[PDB]
């Protein structure tokens, strides 16, 4: 028969700082065992200091990003150019995704930005529009490789204070943008080694009060 | 694991915070209680999206009722709005097991179980362990009608811990709510990792473990 879905692989990573957020993704687009492109962006500036990535089936991901971008445009028209808050964007995306509940978008969506208090925010969605605000989220093929690392290295899970013997947890602390970018780079470097659908390049979008800026790092091409 | 039970002090509502995609742990920090209004709570079990979307939608429908009739919607009415909706989608593959918990002057403390099957049931205690829904608590031994509010909160907290331990798909943290006259009250989020060791040491239970 005709199968309307496909897997384009790739992996995305959202980390929220105190006064910043990052949304990173590899630039590799694959089909089966073939590489389609080594640099095909998957993380997009959507305006109003919101960055978005829908990772999975590339066609459904491109469609969703388009619809949300369009949703931001019509928010401005219908509400006197009001800035779309990240919590509002998140709720809007839930309705976009659930719209196609019985013919889903086969994508894992992460959006990053700043909350209305100016603090870093990451929101994570399932294919049918279930969403939740988080400090950390990896999505896509190598999510299972990266998330445990982020639990350990961002949230300091299973890490205790030396000389207590598990009596006092390591203190939770906001990471600097420079510390976060290291974890993103090491996460993807590690994922690239052990996942065949991850590699070629890494594009990171950093969100601050000043705006959206972009960093690119090469990954192994095998 | 969702628990909602009735007693002299009102309604206790206890839920875990784990979301699973097969054998993959998607999250350990999910809100499985929706705060519909100051006197109405909804528990969430089944499809994460189905519950989130339709119980949020229920909140909208409950708000329109208040504006049109200038009065708090009854738990019976609120439950039936959601039960009549899911029934329209019956067979389409909606997965939803919810307890609508609230207080009203008319009804008093009330718990309604609403199912994606279209089932709507009133009861003094409803439980969702694994993929099954029970008319009794996870333990049920400690249950007496005349229980202290802070004694009753423990039974709810302890009951989620019991299931969280044995069930692979239950865990993360326990979220506690106390429903009374003049609204509900949040009684905090308790990480199961820390709760388990504290409960073990104090209660002298979970001897089959070791630590």
């Amino acid at each position: 028969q005709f199968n309307p879905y496909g897997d384009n692989g790739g992996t995305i990573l959202g980390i929220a700082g105190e006064d910043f957020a990052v949304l990173a993704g590899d630039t590799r687009n694959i089909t089966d065992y073939s590489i389609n492109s080594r640099y095909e962006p998957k993380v997009f500036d959507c305006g109003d200091n919101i960055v978005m990535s829908a990772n999975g089936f590339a066609a459904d991901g491109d469609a969703l990003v388009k619809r949300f971008k369009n949703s931001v445009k019509w928010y401005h028209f219908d509400h006197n150019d009001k800035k779309l808050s990240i919590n509002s964007a998140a709720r809007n995306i839930q309705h976009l995704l659930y719209g196609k509940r019985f013919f889903p978008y086969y994508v894992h969506t992460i959006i990053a930005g700043l909350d209305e208090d100016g603090k870093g925010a990451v929101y994570s969605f399932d294919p049918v529009g279930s969403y939740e605000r988080e400090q950390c989220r990896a999505g896509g093929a190598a999510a299972s490789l990266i998330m445990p690392f982020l639990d350990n290295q961002v949230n300091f899970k299973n890490q205790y204070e030396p000389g207590t013997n598990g009596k006092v947890k390591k203190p939770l602390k906001y990471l600097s943008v420079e510390e976060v970018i290291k974890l993103v780079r090491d996460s993807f470097t590690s994922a690239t080694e052990r996942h065949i659908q991850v590699g070629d390049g890494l594009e990171i979008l950093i969100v601050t009060k000043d705006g959206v800026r972009k960093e690119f790092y090469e990954l192994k091409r095998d | 694991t969702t628990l909602a039970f009735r007693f002299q002090g009102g309604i206790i509502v206890a839920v875990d915070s784990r979301a699973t995609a097969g054998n993959w742990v998607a999250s350990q920090t999910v809100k499985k209680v929706i705060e519909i209004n100051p006197f109405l709570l909804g528990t969430m079990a089944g499809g994460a999206a189905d519950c989130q979307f339709w119980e949020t939608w229920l909140g909208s429908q409950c708000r329109l009722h208040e504006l049109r009739e200038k009065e708090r919607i009854s738990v019976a009415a609120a439950s039936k709005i959601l039960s009549n909706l899911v029934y329209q989608y019956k067979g389409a593959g909606l997965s939803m097991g919810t307890m609508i918990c609230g207080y009203t002057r008319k009804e008093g403390p009330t718990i309604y179980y609403v199912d994606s099957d279209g089932t709507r049931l009133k009861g003094d205690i409803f439980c969702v362990v694994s993929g099954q829904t029970f008319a009794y608590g996870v333990l049920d031994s400690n249950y007496k009608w005349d229980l202290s509010v802070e004694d009753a909160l423990y039974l709810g907290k302890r009951s989620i811990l019991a299931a969280a331990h044995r069930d692979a798909y239950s865990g993360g943290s326990v979220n506690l709510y106390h429903v009374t006259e003049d609204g509900w009250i949040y009684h905090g989020n308790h990480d199961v990792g820390e709760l388990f060791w504290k409960v073990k040491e104090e209660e002298g239970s979970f001897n089959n473990v070791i630590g």
Partner: peptide, 4 residues
């Protein structure tokens, strides 16, 4: 999709 995610699903207590």
């Amino acid at each position: 999709x995610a699903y207590x």
